[PDB]
């Protein structure tokens, strides 16, 4: 748990599979895996010390669109 | 209006403005006739833009100059540069281009620094 990199690789296990269908190492990683996983780490580090609304604000989607998305997803 | 043309002459730190307007043929320098431009040895340095091109071209225009700055010899060289540029520039304006060419060939064959600035800009060797 006090290690810094095994547990990081555990956390972005899923993105790597998703967007490279190995290169877990952060200096051969490429493409949308690189982009999304950087967004991941920054959100975690900022989440421990920022305020809840600004650390995760949601993008703006109109009502019937967002309700439709959540309904399809829950199914 | 009047037909009138202004030119400028320049040696070490002198300056000399010539207004040339069509008139009866007088030449004055700081409000005195040209025949008393002072250092009296170099009066013929001043007369040579007149006597290289004959007097009649100045019989029909009224050239009037003012100088300042510098010393004796520098004001002499500024006056004659301004007069020569004055006469050839008026000739291009208000008579023919051919006579502009003949004037400038006369002054350039004799002494090009009647027309261009003799700038001894330095040299680092």
């Amino acid at each position: 748990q006090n290690d810094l990199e095994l547990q990081q690789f555990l956390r972005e296990s899923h993105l790597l599979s998703a967007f490279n269908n190995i290169v877990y190492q952060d200096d051969q990683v490429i493409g949308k895996a690189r982009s999304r996983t950087l967004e991941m780490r920054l959100n975690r580090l900022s989440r421990v010390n920022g305020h809840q609304d600004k650390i995760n604000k949601l993008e703006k989607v109109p009502m019937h669109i967002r309700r439709g998305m959540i309904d399809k997803h829950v199914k | 209006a009047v037909p009138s043309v202004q030119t400028f002459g320049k040696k070490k730190s002198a300056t000399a403005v010539a207004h040339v307007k069509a008139g009866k043929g007088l030449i004055k320098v700081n409000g005195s006739p040209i025949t008393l431009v002072e250092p009296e040895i170099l009066r013929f340095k001043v007369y040579e833009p007149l006597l290289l091109v004959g007097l009649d071209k100045f019989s029909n225009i009224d050239i009037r100059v003012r100088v300042t700055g510098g010393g004796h010899v520098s004001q002499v060289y500024a006056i004659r540069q301004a007069i020569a540029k004055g006469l050839v520039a008026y000739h291009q304006k208000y008579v023919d281009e051919q006579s502009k060419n003949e004037l400038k060939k006369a002054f350039t064959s004799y002494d090009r620094t009647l027309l261009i600035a003799d700038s001894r800009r330095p040299e680092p060797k």
């Binding site: 290169v23 051969q28 490429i30 493409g31 | -």
Partner: protein, 61 residues
């Protein structure tokens, strides 16, 4: 009374000698300072990304 400046230091045998021994040590060790006269595979998919971005960059430029 006071002064406003330490005055200039008179050059002595001791001062010269200190200076020489500095120089001698730096010249024995030869760590003396000069102005130096300057000079003048990957993976399949990284190679693919490079290729695309180079073609894209050539058209833009």
């Amino acid at each position: 009374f006071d002064r406003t400046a330490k005055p200039v230091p008179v050059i002595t045998s001791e001062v010269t000698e200190s200076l020489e021994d500095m120089i001698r040590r730096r010249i024995q060790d030869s760590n003396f300072d000069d102005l130096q006269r300057r000079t003048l595979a990957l993976s399949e998919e990284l190679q693919k990304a490079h290729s695309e971005i180079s073609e894209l960059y050539a058209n833009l430029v």
